């Protein structure tokens, strides 16, 4: 409820990613706003280093589950907000079928009134003319359920889930996600019963923007608990 108090209105968001994929360095900066009451967020991302060396859709999951709308009966299961304002570390491995792997580490926390997601990403073993480095993925993103379970040993949560990116030739590229979150502070956190997060994502372009970029709208809502 203390953490959850921080999210009662519209919250500015800042995202910073420093990326290295097959030795190719890049940076992304994102800004916008989040409304956890309605499970909604709006963000625009820029590759500040020039051309992004991987496809924007492959970065969506990496680029703030604290903005999920948790219904009233499920408030006691919201680990993400309970960890605020000190925040949580979020780590993944993302394994692209027949291609490379991303490893990510992020800290998601308040800095003043701004929720900040600061990420480091390392990608290795990518095929230089595969779907990823060859930019063969459609500019879109499907709806997914991300199943959350408690990890009481790490006093946090975990999740594994499959993302399926559409490829331009009509096939699909699997990206297998394993995720772990752990609180940054020592204060008490909420450890949840099993549930999931239903996310929809809409990608677009700003017709006035000349930099390499992604405009993102998402709606996220928690569900699957009864009593």
Author numbering: 2 to 64, 68 to 231
Question: Could you give the paper's own sentences about this structure?
Answer:
We have used superfolder GFP (sfGFP) as a model system to exemplify and understand mechanism of action of these two different nnPTM routes. SfGFP26 is an intrinsically fluorescent protein derived from the original Aequorea victoria GFP. H148 plays an important role in defining the fluorescence properties of GFP through the contribution of the imidazole side chain to the charge transfer network that modulates chromophore protonation state equilibrium, and maintaining local structural integrity. We have demonstrated the versatility of genetically encoded phenyl azide chemistry to positively switch protein function through two different non-native PTM events: photolysis and bioorthogonal modification.
